[PDB]
């Protein structure tokens, strides 16, 4: 098990509204991984873009971690690490940006 408390992009268990209050004041590409208060042990990537905070479910299925079925990872850390370098465009044309800046910057 990986301890995600280490990373400056992990916000723990935090509500959707609190996330839009926290991220609205930052540049596009600022992101955080949070745990969804309504689904225990399920996570979300929240990322500011176009002056609005977008939210993406992290699905866990058949031991894969993924935000699109077309690209899968062994772990949440590897997911985040891939999308820090490769734009979300390849599966979210609504959202052309990498995970550039963790919110604790």
């Amino acid at each position: 098990e990986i301890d995600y408390t280490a990373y400056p992009w992990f916000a723990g268990n935090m509500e959707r509204q609190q996330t839009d209050n926290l991220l609205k004041s930052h540049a596009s590409g600022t992101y955080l991984i949070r745990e969804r208060p309504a689904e225990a042990e399920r996570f979300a990537i929240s990322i500011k873009f176009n002056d609005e905070v977008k939210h993406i479910k992290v699905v866990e299925k058949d031991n894969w971690i993924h935000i699109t079925e077309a690209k899968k990872f062994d772990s949440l850390l590897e997911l985040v690490e891939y999308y820090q370098c490769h734009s979300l465009k390849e599966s979210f044309k609504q959202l052309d940006t990498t995970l550039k800046y963790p919110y604790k910057s």
Binding site: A44, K54, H55, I56, K57, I67, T68, E69, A70, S91, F92, K93, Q94, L95
Partner: peptide
Amino acid sequence: NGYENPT
């Protein structure tokens, strides 16, 4: 739904 949808 509620979140963002892929593709």
